[PDB]
Amino acid sequence: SELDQLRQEAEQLKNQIRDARKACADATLSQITNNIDPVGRIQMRTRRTLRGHLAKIYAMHWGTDSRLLVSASQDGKLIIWDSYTTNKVHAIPLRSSWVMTCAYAPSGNYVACGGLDNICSIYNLKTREGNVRVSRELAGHTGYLSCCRFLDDNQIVTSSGDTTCALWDIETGQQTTTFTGHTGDVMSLSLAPDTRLFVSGACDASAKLWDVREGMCRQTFTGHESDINAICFFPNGNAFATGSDDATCRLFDLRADQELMTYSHDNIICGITSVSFSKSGRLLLAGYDDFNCNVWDALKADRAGVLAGHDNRVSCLGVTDDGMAVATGSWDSFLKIWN
Amino acid sequence: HFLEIDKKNCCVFRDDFIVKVLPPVLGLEFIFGLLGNGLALWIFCFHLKSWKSSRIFLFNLAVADFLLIICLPFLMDNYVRRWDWKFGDIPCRLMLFMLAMNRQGSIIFLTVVAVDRYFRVVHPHHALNKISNRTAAIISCLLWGITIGLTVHLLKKKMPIQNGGANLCSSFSICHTFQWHEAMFLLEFFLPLGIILFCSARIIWSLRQRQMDRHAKIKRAITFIMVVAIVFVICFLPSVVVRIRIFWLLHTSGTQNCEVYRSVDLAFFITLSFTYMNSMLDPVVYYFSSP
Amino acid sequence: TASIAQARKLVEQLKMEANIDRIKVSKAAADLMAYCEAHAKEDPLLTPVPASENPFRE
Amino acid sequence: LSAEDKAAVERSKMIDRNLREDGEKAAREVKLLLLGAGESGKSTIVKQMKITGIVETHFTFKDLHFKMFDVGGQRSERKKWIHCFEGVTAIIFCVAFTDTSIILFLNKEIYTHFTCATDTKNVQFVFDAVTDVIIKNNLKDCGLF
Amino acid sequence: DVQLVESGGGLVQPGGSRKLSCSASGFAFSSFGMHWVRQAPEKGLEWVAYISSGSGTIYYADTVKGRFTISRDDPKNTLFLQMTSLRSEDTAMYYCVRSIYYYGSSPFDFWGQGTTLTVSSSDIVMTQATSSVPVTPGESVSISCRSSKSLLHSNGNTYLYWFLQRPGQSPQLLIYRMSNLASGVPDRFSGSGSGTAFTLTISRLEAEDVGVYYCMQHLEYPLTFGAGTKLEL
Ligand SMILES: Cc1cnc(C(=O)O)c[n+]1O
């Protein structure tokens, strides 16, 4: 009399929200963009190769200056690179070698990392001594830690394998807000360029939108068949793209509240590990299990090129804030920068 | 048939059988080796995306084979006109030096690959099995220097041998004198043969004794190491046994009657072509069979 | 009654998720197209810059 | 190239050499992923060659370092650490991945070994199993297999 | 905290030898390259020698090359300057200077207190036209420095450094690479210039802004200073 009624109410709410989405689904993005000119074939070559890691590279991030990047690896080493000159700036040893994520603070005074130790650890890169020391280790996540992203020098959101997200205050070391609406392990994050919202994909094949200050889920996006491994905001913050294990990318948008485009080819069966956007949002770069990344025309959903210089599963890729280059990491322990 | 060079009594022949058989087999060898080694180098440079350390040795072997193959057509032109080299003085030295040095480099890099496999199969937990790329490149440079230094002796000679009107450009004339060029030949055979046989036997013994032979890829690997050993033996044994026969004939009869050397000389210069056939078999047996 | 509380929380979340204005797909697609077009000349990866103003060079 | 850039290059080279030393130190170690039910007698063997997150164990037999990563305690999904553990040489299983070997132990290619009274035989068996998988990675590394 | 303490010297007969020691504490001594800088009584700064991190690279001034030897003891965080065949021109106050080099770093941050040595008896030229400028507090003052050649490099950064030496204290960095503000210094210090001419601007003058200001180039060795400019109240 109670559980059945609540289930029926949830089902009818889902039906009505799907009907509302269908009502505004009169047009299609492909139909609108059929008239525009094709982007054409794009050849992008490996301009820099960064060597020094002795294990599979799992994460990388760019600095907001677009010159410095930090990469994590299974050898228990954080390496800050100078992409212009290929030479290393720092090498931060880690207590645990099972790190799965790394973040670069937008100011540049801190870096973060985390993994199977259930801790995103903040490292102070600007000390009076010439060493990098661990500023603080944030604990409280039940499961592993798959992504943490810096909001500012004092705030950071973390996604975790305990189906939750959390917003931390670094000085105190405690969570300020928690985000609990997912069902499966949260595998990815992407902060909006205004630092007001973020999207998180999980193993329940759904992506959710959160307001950082509100602390509650705002929109839920479905459509993928398997777990979502990557997520990325459109440059204007009004849309986002998801990559999953069922070998397809999907572009969702927040205002219309539904999927707009599907990026899949019959020649691709391997899953998707990473996804990013060009500075204008016209290109969508997705990395795959089949050892190479390929470029997608974001408005026409056709391939425009391939990044095929890696010898293993491309696990990470990212584009600079000024859009001059994209850096990809793989399990062959090399980082390549493409222009 | 007698022609002394400086102080060595040498018997030289210009038999017409050198033009009936050698130019065709060497032309086939040139074409197939050029195709195979060009494809091997093209794949090694462009479509590899992986170097490690053993591929460095394989690339050096391919380089030596290609350098011998590009040298083969001049041997063609020599053979088609019955020892009538006409290019000059420096280009004949360059031929002989390149041929000998590239054959030695191929043999040393075969031995290096064999020792690499032996250390990867009989001492898997050894430092040499996880060597750096810089160390591999430096070792390759040192080995190339070793071969070049062993072959300089052919680069510091005057080699327009005027055999009346022939202008002979041969390197293995039948001469009653033990020079470094023949001891180097015999060592090139025997010492790498000993190392290769030891490494192959120990690899097979370790693989079988660990009962790892029952796989399908491991059986193919054992078969192909047997095949590379057999190819080395088949290509390098006939010329060496003919050289040993020549030494025995010199020590028994001597240069006083050179007519007894005609058959042995023809046989030596016929079976010397299997040495280059080894270079033209190399892409098929070492690169195109990687699985 | 933990399951009942979870169901009530889900009902509230879906109800609040159902109370947001939704823009027609045509308008959102046009907005994305306009944003891509207006910043197309600013994209270094879409339009390859010459080697002079390339921070990464051989 | 300026003096400051030269000194930065020198710093990068010193970092490179420190990384080389650490990698040479870690190249003589092997990582083994240990699975179990948590209450299936695994602790017996764990303490047999012994003498939140994942537990690490260290034990040496013959110039070769083994790391044991007991993951039976975690209740999380089995497949969600596989992408993290995709590179381990072998997986050890105690009972009462297209090219990753499995080592099997009986408390009371797949390698099987019934537990003996002395832990020496068990350690020898696991050492032999790691030898074979290292032999075959070395072969792949070469090009033969 | 970070501190460098110097020892040795004080009275040396001409032609003799001496050993200056610099004991460091409070920071990772091994990661920093270390400089020796001396200033004569009533004279500006003068770079002496440089030993890099890991002892890989060593430089000497042309006036001390051969006679001086710089070395470090990383276990004990100690810096040495073996000084031999000492001349009457070698009497000065010697400073032990801390510097690290990576992208975005500030070298020449911390200076030791100094030790006094009394001896009984092609490169870039940095020029400061003025020597003494009396300014009342609260008035913006401009300090200029000129270079013999352009300090701008292909990287786009010009290697110009500014130091302030208060009366009785060692110099402290306030501007590095002509634009950046050193850690811990007030925001009223600003640096500008283009290639050859440079200007340091102080907005409001407190009682702690009184001292001698030095302009330094780090484009190439030998490192060169300019004749300092003194501010009076
Ligand atoms: C005729 C001939 C045949 N082979 C060689 C060689 O050194 O391989 C040299 N010459 O002169």
Domains belonging to chain A, first-starting first, are 2-339 (2.130.10.10)
E24 contact partners, CB below 8 Å, separation of at least 6: E3, E4, E5, E77, E78, E79, E96, E98
CA distance B251 to B255: 9
Task: Measure Cα distances from A166 to A263, B219, C12, D25, E56 in Å.
Answer: 31, 55, 21, 37, 47
- Spatial strand order in the sheet of A228-233: A228-233, A239-244, A249-253, A258-263
Find which of C32, C43, C47 to mutate to test the A interface (most A CBs within 10 Å of its CB): C32
DSSP state of E12: B
Task: Give the binding-site residues of ligand 1, using a 6 Å CB cut-off.
Answer: B 96, 99-100, 169-171, 272
CB B125 within 8 A of CB B210: no
Residue among A233, A247, A246 nearest A298 (CA) = A233
Question: Whose structure tokens read 């670094």?
Answer: A170
Q: Which of D3, D10, D11 sits opposite E221 (nearest CB)?
A: D3
Domain B10-287 in CATH 1.20.1070.10 = yes
E111 - beta bridge partners?
A: E97
Question: Whose structure tokens read 């392990």?
Answer: A185
Chain A residues closer than 8 Å to C23 by CB: 24, 255-256
Question: What is the token pair recorded at C25?
Answer: 């797909």
In ligand 1, the atom with minimum distance to the C-alpha of B100 is: 7
Q: Which of A87, A96, A100 sits opposite D8 (nearest CB)?
A: A87
Q: Is the dihedral of CA D87, D89, D93, D94 positive or negative?
A: negative
Question: What is the token pair recorded at B68?
Answer: 């011998």
Residue among A324, A262, A338 nearest A293 (CA) = A338
C-alpha triplet A170, A174, A180: angle, nearest 5°: 115
Residue among A75, A156, A89, A81 nearest A119 (CA) = A156
B178 contact partners, CB below 8 Å, separation of at least 6: none
Residue among B237, B231, B222, B238 nearest B285 (CA) = B231
For chain A, how long is the longest CA-to-CA vector?
A: 69
Burial E20-38 (b: 16+ CB within 10 A, else e): bbbbbeebbbebbbbbbbb
Residue among B51, B114, C12 nearest A6 (CA) = C12
Does B217 lie at the interface with D, CB-CB under 8 angstroms? yes
- Quoted resolution (Å): 2.8
Find which of B61, B125, B203, B225 to mutate to test the D interface (most D CBs within 10 Å of its CB): B125
Residue among A250, A211, A212 nearest A228 (CA) = A250
CA distance B65 to B281: 10
CA distance A166 to A145: 11
Task: Measure Cα distances from E185 to B54, B76, E164, E200 in Å.
Answer: 57, 81, 11, 14
CA distance E155 to E161: 17
CB E149 within 8 A of CB E196: yes
Question: What is the token pair recorded at A146?
Answer: 């798959």
Q: Are strands E160-165 and E172-176 parallel, antiparallel or unpaired?
A: antiparallel
**Which amino acids of D are annotated as binding site, given as ranges?**
39-44, 70-74, 107-108, 117
Task: Measure Cα distances from A148 to A121, A124, E67, E124 in Å.
Answer: 10, 16, 56, 48
Chain D residues closer than 8 Å to B224 by CB: 144
Q: Is the dihedral of CA A218, A224, A229, A232 positive or negative?
A: negative
A283 - beta bridge partners?
A: A297
Residue among A79, E30, B260, E100 nearest D22 (CA) = A79
CA distance A313 to A336: 13
Q: Is the dihedral of CA A48, A50, A55, A58 positive or negative?
A: negative
Reported as type and span, the H/E element at residue E143 is strand E141-147
**Cα nearest neighbour of E159 on chain D:** D4
State whether D76 and A117 contact (CB < 8 Å): no
Question: What is the token pair recorded at E144?
Answer: 């200029």
H-type alpha helices, B50-132 = 54-80, 90-122
- Spatial strand order in the sheet of A303-307: A272-277, A283-288, A293-297, A303-307
Reported as type and span, the H/E element at residue C14 is helix C2-17
CA distance B242 to B88: 30
CA distance A331 to A53: 10
B104 contact partners, CB below 8 Å, separation of at least 6: B147, B150, B151, B184, B188
Fold that domain E126-230 belongs to in CATH: Immunoglobulin-like (2.60.40)
- The ranges assigned to domains in chain B are 10-287
CA distance A126 to A130: 8
Question: What is the token pair recorded at E182?
Answer: 């050193």
Amino acid present at B55: R
Q: Is the dihedral of CA A140, A142, A145, A146 positive or negative?
A: negative
In ligand 1, the atom with minimum distance to the C-alpha of B103 is: 8
Q: Which of D28, D141, D145 sits opposite B221 (nearest CB)?
A: D145
E94 contact partners, CB below 8 Å, separation of at least 6: E6, E9, E20, E36, E37, E38, E48, E81, E114, E115, E116, E117
Does some domain include residue C40? yes
CA distance A221 to A205: 9
CA distance A119 to A335: 25
Task: Measure Cα distances from D130 to B91, B224, D61, D89 in Å.
Answer: 55, 25, 12, 7
A200 - beta bridge partners?
A: A208
CB atoms within 10 A of CB C12: 11
Task: Tell the burial category of E41 from Cβ atoms under 10 Å away from its Cβ (0-12, 13-18, 19+).
Answer: exposed
Domain E6-117 in CATH 2.60.40.10 = yes
What 3-state class would DSSP assign to E131?
coil
Task: Measure Cα distances from D38 to A98, A136, D42, D71, E5 in Å.
Answer: 21, 32, 7, 9, 58
Question: What is the token pair recorded at A77?
Answer: 């080493």
Q: How many domains does chain C have?
A: 1
Residue A330: how many CA atoms within 13 Å on its side-chain side? 24
Question: Whose structure tokens read 């060493």?
Answer: A131
DSSP collapsed to 3 states, chain D: CCHHHHHHHHHHHHHHHHHHHHHHHHCCEEEEEEECCCCCCHHHHHHHCCCCCCEEEEEECCCCEEEEEECCCCCCCHHHCCCCCCCCCEEEEEECCCCCEEEEEECCCEEEEECCCCHHHHHHHHHHHHHHHHHHHHHHHHCCC
Distance B145 CA to ligand 1 centre (A): 21
Query: How remote is the C-alpha of B79 from its chain's centroid?
Result: 19
B101 contact partners, CB below 8 Å, separation of at least 6: B147, B148, B150, B151
What 3-state class would DSSP assign to E198?
strand
CA distance A87 to A89: 7
Question: What is the token pair recorded at B220?
Answer: 């193919």
What 3-state class would DSSP assign to C22?
coil
CA distance C36 to C30: 10
CB atoms within 10 A of CB A61: 22
For A120: left if phi > 0, alpha if psi spans -120 to 50, otherwise beta; the answer is: beta
CA distance D4 to E216: 14
Q: Are strands E33-39 and E92-99 parallel, antiparallel or unpaired?
A: antiparallel
Amino acid present at B266: L
DSSP state of E185: S
Write out the DSSP string of B121-168: HH-SSSGGGG--HHHHHHHHHHHHHHHHHHHGGGTSS---B--TT--B
Question: Whose structure tokens read 């950046």?
Answer: E180
List phi, psi (to 5°) of A200. -135, 130
State whether D141 and B54 contact (CB < 8 Å): yes
Residue among B65, B151, B152 nearest B106 (CA) = B65
CB atoms within 10 A of CB C53: 8
Does some domain include residue C30? yes
CB D109 within 8 A of CB D132: yes
DSSP collapsed to 3 states, chain A: CCHHHHHHHHHHHHHHHHHHHHHCCCCCHHHHHCCCCCCCCCCCCEEEEECCCCCCEEEEEECCCCCEEEEEECCCEEEEEECCCCCEEEEEECCCCCEEEEEECCCCCEEEEEECCCCEEEEECCCCCCCCEEEEEECCCCCCEEEEEECCCCEEEEEECCCCEEEEECCCCEEEEEECCCCCCECCCEECCCCCEEEEEECCCEEEEEECCCCCEEEEEECCCCCEEEEEECCCCCEEEEEECCCCEEEEECCCCEEEEEECCCCCCCCEEEEEECCCCCEEEEEECCCCEEEEECCCCCEEEEECCCCCCEEEEEECCCCCCEEEEECCCCEEEEC
CA distance E194 to A244: 52
What 3-state class would DSSP assign to E232?
strand
Task: Measure Cα distances from C35 to A153, A281, A298, A335 in Å.
Answer: 30, 8, 12, 31
Residue E222: cis peptide before it, omega within 30 degrees of 0: yes
A129 contact partners, CB below 8 Å, separation of at least 6: E2, E26, E27, E28
**Which amino acids of D are annotated as binding site for Mg(2+), given as ranges?**
43
Question: Whose structure tokens read 């106050």?
Answer: E93
A232 - beta bridge partners?
A: A241
Instruction: Find the domain containing C28 and state its range.
Output: 21-46
CA distance B172 to B256: 19
A167 contact partners, CB below 8 Å, separation of at least 6: A151, A155, A156, A157, A175, A176, A177, A178, A179, A212, A215
Distance B104 CA to ligand 1 centre (A): 13
Long-range contacts of E71-77 (CB under 8 A, 24+ apart): E72/E29, E72/E34, E74/E29, E74/E30, E76/E23, E77/E23, E77/E24, E77/E25, E77/E29, E77/E30
**Cα nearest neighbour of A323 on chain C:** C44
Query: How remote is the C-alpha of C38 from its chain's centroid?
Result: 16
CB E100 within 8 A of CB E87: no
Long-range contacts of A219-222 (CB under 8 A, 24+ apart): A219/A254, A219/A257, A219/C17, A219/C20, A220/A181, A220/C17, A221/A252, A221/A257, A221/A258, A221/A259
Reported as type and span, the H/E element at residue B240 is helix B216-252
DSSP state of E208: G
DSSP state of B285: I
CA distance E208 to E39: 21
Question: What is the token pair recorded at D116?
Answer: 């003996």
The four Cα atoms B211, B217, B223, B225 give a dihedral, to 10 degrees, of -90
- Spatial strand order in the sheet of D101-106: D55-60, D65-70, D29-35, D90-95, D101-106, D110-114
CA distance A288 to B131: 31
Please identify among residues 176-205 of chain A the ones whose CB lies closer than 8 Å to any CB of chain C. Answer: 181
Question: Whose structure tokens read 């990044």?
Answer: A307
Find which of A80, A82, A128 to mutate to test the E interface (most E CBs within 10 Å of its CB): A128
CA distance A236 to A259: 17
A317 - beta bridge partners?
A: A328
CA distance B204 to B220: 12
Which ranges in chain E are annotated with CATH 2.60.40.10?
A: 6-117, 126-230
Burial E128-150 (b: 16+ CB within 10 A, else e): beeeeeebeeeeebebbbebeee
CB E123 within 8 A of CB E222: yes
CA distance E111 to E97: 5
